[PDB]
Amino acid sequence: GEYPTVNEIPVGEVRLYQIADGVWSHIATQSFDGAVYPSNGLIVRDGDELLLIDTAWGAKNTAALLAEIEKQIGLPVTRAVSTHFHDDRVGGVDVLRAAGVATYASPSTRRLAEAEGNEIPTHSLEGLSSSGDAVRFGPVELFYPGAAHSTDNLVVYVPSANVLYGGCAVHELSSTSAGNVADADLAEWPTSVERIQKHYPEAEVVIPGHGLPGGLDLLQHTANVVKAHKN
């Protein structure tokens, strides 16, 4: 019942965590440049179907995610959104697409994924190209806060439950560093976080791209660690 960590997640298996009624996170682990990392995604019930947010970081992890969803929830995943272009968000899109899931991302994410050699979601999400933009997608709202962890990062809000999924633009409270910042805009990131804070002041659960969910404090903490990283 505690939030899963790598010490309970061998690379290749996936765990789900119930966040609220009809909202789960998914947690998987992956190795990258010789270190092991956890990463989160989201599952949101969409009537008798499910909307998936982000892959489980890899083809085999994403196959394991689909099997875990079938075991624990038993409703079909019909659509998936990837919230930026890195492999913890799109790696596994080919698995999803061969399992009949329609895969979506912003045009910016699709272009960056293609240029990087990462898997490419099929469908483009328009209406998200300017910071502050929001669109509805099934039971969620997608929001583009501006450049942060990456120039294309999206956040996801579940209005029925006041769940804010920040993705990799939001870090967990225990973080001491701003993660992998190679594609980040450290100067713009606090402004983008401020936009999230202004847009979703009633969020009750905030889920980072990696690590433990918490409350709204994750947003200010993220701004703090980014500003200190920059400096």
Ligand X SMILES: C[C@H](Oc1ccc(CN)cc1)c1cccc2c(-c3ccc(CS(C)(=O)=O)c(F)c3)c(C(=O)O)[nH]c12
Q: Are the C-beta atoms of 7 and 18 separated by less than 8 Å?
A: no
Measured CA to CA, the distance from residue 113 to residue 110 in angstroms comes to 5
Measured CA to CA, the distance from residue 1 to residue 144 in angstroms comes to 32
86 binds Zn ion (CB under 5 A): yes
Residues annotated within a binding site for Zn(2+): 84, 86, 88, 124, 126, 149, 168, 210
Q: Which does 22 bind (CB under 5 to 8 A by kind): Zn ion, ligand X, none?
A: none
Instruction: Show the tokens assigned to 115.
Output: 């240029």
119 binds ligand X (CB under 6 A): no
Nearest residue to the partner ligand X, using Cβ? 179
Q: Which of 183, 216, 224, 230 binds ligand X (CB under 6 A)?
A: 183
CA distances from 66 to 50, 95, 100, 107 (A): 11, 9, 11, 25
- Give the number of C-alpha atoms closer than 13 A to the C-alpha of residue 51, restricted to the C-beta side: 20
Please say if 40 is a catalytic residue.
no
- Catalytically annotated residue among 94, 180, 199, 229: 180
168 binds Zn ion (CB under 5 A): yes
Please say if 229 is a catalytic residue.
no
Give the range of 109-117, 131-139, 199-207, 209-217 binding Zn ion by CB under 5 A.
209-217
Q: Which of 121, 208, 209, 213 binds Zn ion (CB under 5 A)?
A: 209
- Catalytically annotated residue among 26, 118, 149, 185: 149
Size of the site for ligand X (CB under 6 A): 18
Q: Which of 114, 127, 177, 228 binds ligand X (CB under 6 A)?
A: 177
What are the backbone dihedrals phi and psi of residue 91, each rounded to the nearest 5 degrees, phi first? -70, 110
77 binds Zn ion (CB under 5 A): no
Please say if 171 is a catalytic residue.
no
CB of 154 to Zn ion, least distance (A): 12
Size of the site for Zn ion (CB under 5 A): 4
Percentages (nearest 5) of helix, strand, coil residues in the chain:
25, 30, 45
- Catalytically annotated residue among 26, 40, 61, 84: 84
Q: Are the C-beta atoms of 181 and 149 separated by less than 8 Å?
A: yes
Please say if 84 is a catalytic residue.
yes
Burial of 113 (0-12, 13-18, 19+ CB in 10 A): buried
DSSP 178-193: ----TT--TTTHHHHH
Give catalytic residues, as residue numbers. Answer: 84, 86, 88, 149, 180
Binding residues (CB under 6 A) for ligand X: these are 32, 37, 86-88, 149, 168, 171, 175-177, 179-180, 182-183, 209-211
